[PDB]
Amino acid sequence: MRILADENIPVVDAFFADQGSIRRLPGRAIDRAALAEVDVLLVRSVTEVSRAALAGSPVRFVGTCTIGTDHLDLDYFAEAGIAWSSAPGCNARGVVDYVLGCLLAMAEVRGADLAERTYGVVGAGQVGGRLVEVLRGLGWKVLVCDPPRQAREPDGEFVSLERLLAEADVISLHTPLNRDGEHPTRHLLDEPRLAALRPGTWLVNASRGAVVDNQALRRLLEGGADLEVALDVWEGEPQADPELAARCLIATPHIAGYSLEGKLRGTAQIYQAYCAWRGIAERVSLQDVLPETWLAGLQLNPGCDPAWALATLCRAVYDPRSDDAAFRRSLTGDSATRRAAFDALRKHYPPRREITGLRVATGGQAELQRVVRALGAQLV
Amino acid sequence: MRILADENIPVVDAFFADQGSIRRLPGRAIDRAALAEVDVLLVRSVTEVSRAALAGSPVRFVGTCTIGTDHLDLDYFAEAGIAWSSAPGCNARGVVDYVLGCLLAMAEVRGADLAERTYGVVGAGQVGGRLVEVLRGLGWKVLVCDPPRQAREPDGEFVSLERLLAEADVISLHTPLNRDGEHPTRHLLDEPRLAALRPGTWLVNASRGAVVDNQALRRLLEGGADLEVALDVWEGEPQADPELAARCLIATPHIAGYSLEGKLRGTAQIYQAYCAWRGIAERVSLQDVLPETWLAGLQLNPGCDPAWALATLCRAVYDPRSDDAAFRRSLTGDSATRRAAFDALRKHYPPRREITGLRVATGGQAELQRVVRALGAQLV
Numbered sequence A, B: 001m002r003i004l005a006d007e008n009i010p011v012v013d014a015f016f017a018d019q020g021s022i023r024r025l026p027g028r029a030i031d032r033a034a035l036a037e038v039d040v041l042l043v044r045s046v047t048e049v050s051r052a053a054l055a056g057s058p059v060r061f062v063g064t065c066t067i068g069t070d071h072l073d074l075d076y077f078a079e080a081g082i083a084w085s086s087a088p089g090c091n092a093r094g095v096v097d098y099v100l101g102c103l104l105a106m107a108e109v110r111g112a113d114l115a116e117r118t119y120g121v122v123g124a125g126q127v128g129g130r131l132v133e134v135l136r137g138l139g140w141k142v143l144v145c146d147p148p149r150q151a152r153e154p155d156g157e158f159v160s161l162e163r164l165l166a167e168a169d170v171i172s173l174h175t176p177l178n179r180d181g182e183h184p185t186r187h188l189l190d191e192p193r194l195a196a197l198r199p200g201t202w203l204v205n206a207s208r209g210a211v212v213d214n215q216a217l218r219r220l221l222e223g224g225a226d227l228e229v230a231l232d233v234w235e236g237e238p239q240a241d242p243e244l245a246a247r248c249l250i251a252t253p254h255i256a257g258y259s260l261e262g263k264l265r266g267t268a269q270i271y272q273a274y275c276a277w278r279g280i281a282e283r284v285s286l287q288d289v290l291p292e293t294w295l296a297g298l299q300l301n302p303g304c305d306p307a308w309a310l311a312t313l314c315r316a317v318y319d320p321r322s323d324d325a326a327f328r329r330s331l332t333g334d335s336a337t338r339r340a341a342f343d344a345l346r347k348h349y350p351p352r353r354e355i356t357g358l359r360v361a362t363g364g365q366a367e368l369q370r371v372v373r374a375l376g377a378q379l380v
């Protein structure tokens, strides 16, 4: 089999070596001429995989993470007999860890009990759906806004955006950025909705920048709004609003998803679908390819306060306050240097693991076991 | 014996029930009237154990674990044949953990490598000497200023203040507050010394308030001085200068030494001293009253980044950023409110353990074992 991968995609050889020959090219340097001897194509959201792009090539499999099934010509793939993988939630778990870390920072500045908060998750797909089950696993109140999922799941309990805004004191956004369609999400949080946020409400946005009206948010905070704000995604990336950032509790350069696992999981998931398509057993796993974690595990004694355990567990793996500190330093120069620094932070992002990889002994304590399980960490 | 103790002194029964009667009183309510029926006196800093208070009473032993020995009339004790104990170092290690947490916070904001700093420790007694041992154990560059110790230990490695202040870019202060003598420490850090600090220098003061000129510090920081500052001790306590505090990376209500085991060790050391004075064998020990840790331990894999391990281990036990958050909130009301809120945080300080009680597995990696031993954590 003859493989072509976008050069940015890691660990292609480890997964696909015994599968045939691998060739690697830049994303936009992959066109009609390159595809002439390609059986399996592995791309990101840069390379074109449309009818125009693919017709006349021996391409039988298209694998990606960055592109959703809304932006793949699946009717064409069916027509041409091309298999596909749009690996769901390649970098999803990392975002869940980031939100948890933000909530911990927020609870700490405020002296708040996280368990008494009312959570509102807008968008409950790969990321939001994972967040929801952590929060609920801990026994916390979660309101879920997801109109599409509501229409397909008549038995589930969903709420409207305006009820969520009415009842939630913690909001986390996890929708795509849709300008059009049935349920548009650009400035889903506009000035009137942001201005109506009750004093002491918390907001996390690690979806896409333009889901929140950044300029309205900045002015609302400058005006003295009583809020806690964590933003991982900004309206003009790599040019984040520096006066908005200065008013955010947590401000990071679109790195929420940037776990070590999340960068390699994309390749692993494509390979799994590729094995499922070919009807072959998997020869190499994500585990096989991941380096050993730095923190194997942690032991709690059964007297440990559950809330204390939660904060200790999450922060031992990842505290976004460290990324926040690096981001503040990136905002010191002129527009041009801030932009370059934004992208450099993302490129040189340090090795960061996921909470699901942490092994936790609890000494058999039930409330501690509940915390480990809700987090998705491993009981040992 | 007939024991009287400040009602806030813990575990007096466990250590003293076998010795006779035990009475308690609030600290400030202890005077010569109250001392008529007392052989063994156990106090805190809030009560004067003076010539006027002790004359005619049968008090033969005095024990204390608190801030300094200024409330004790040590000359009179030597005169009157009164045995005593200040339980030296009872609360020392909590301050060490506090300083480490400050350095971690400071490195994170500045993006600094802790291993590249030059550390100056001014005062190397119970606290400073412990700090020095940690810093040296990690292989870091350390300067020690302690003129009393140097004069008595002339073959030691000591340096003048002037030179320490010129060479060090991280200064931590651990002297007493002395107005007079050959080496007075009131405003040891004054306008000209503070002004001549190399740009980007970190200053930690968890000794006593008036060792640093708070007003001069505040004006320098307002004037744009390139410095990081961590203060646990303030001129005017409980009335911290809020404009100063706002410019400190870390600001806390004099709680550096408020670890749970410090309070227990105080009584336990006093008992050990009491047993020597009475010439009896020690029966009760700290282990008899010490609660189990909440966090038993952490397991590191051999490939763990040493610098990451240091930060993770320290913070897993205690991060003073949490106390800083609670302290920021205490600074919101009027003068009377801030003063009372300062004391409320000290009186109701949450349970907090010591880094020395942490058990760490390292997979036999030498660089990691070095970090664990330097920290004084338990290698397993």
Ligand SMILES: NC(=O)c1ccc[n+]([C@@H]2O[C@H](COP(=O)([O-])OP(=O)(O)OC[C@H]3O[C@@H](n4cnc5c(N)ncnc54)[C@H](O)[C@@H]3O)[C@@H](O)[C@H]2O)c1
Binding pocket: A089, A091, A092, A095, A122, A123, A124, A125, A126, A127, A128, A145, A146, A147, A148, A149, A174, A175, A176, A177, A183, A184, A185, A206, A207, A208, A232, A233, A254, A255, A256, A257, A258
């Ligand atoms: N910051 C990061 O590092 C990072 C990392 C990964 C993903 N993301 C972003 O997170 C967002 C969600 O990612 P995902 O993988 O979970 O996507 P997903 O498509 O799996 O889930 C999105 C959910 O949003 C719902 N939704 C759509 N419109 C909505 C609306 N108007 N109101 C409420 N819900 C709506 C959809 O039904 C879906 O369930 C995306 O914007 C993605 O780009 C960010």
Ligand SMILES: NC(=O)c1ccc[n+]([C@@H]2O[C@H](COP(=O)([O-])OP(=O)(O)OC[C@H]3O[C@@H](n4cnc5c(N)ncnc54)[C@H](O)[C@@H]3O)[C@@H](O)[C@H]2O)c1
Binding pocket: B067, B068, B089, B091, B092, B095, B122, B123, B124, B125, B126, B127, B128, B145, B146, B147, B148, B149, B174, B175, B176, B177, B183, B184, B185, B206, B207, B208, B232, B233, B254, B255, B256, B257, B258
């Ligand atoms: N913030 C807290 O919670 C907390 C807790 C414990 C102690 N403290 C304070 O920390 C300081 C030290 O405590 P300790 O128990 O280590 O006291 P200690 O007496 O054991 O040590 C003080 C050291 O300072 C040295 N010294 C004296 N004058 C000096 C000078 N001019 N320059 C340099 N060094 C000098 C002395 O020789 C001595 O070695 C005290 O002020 C104490 O009150 C604060």
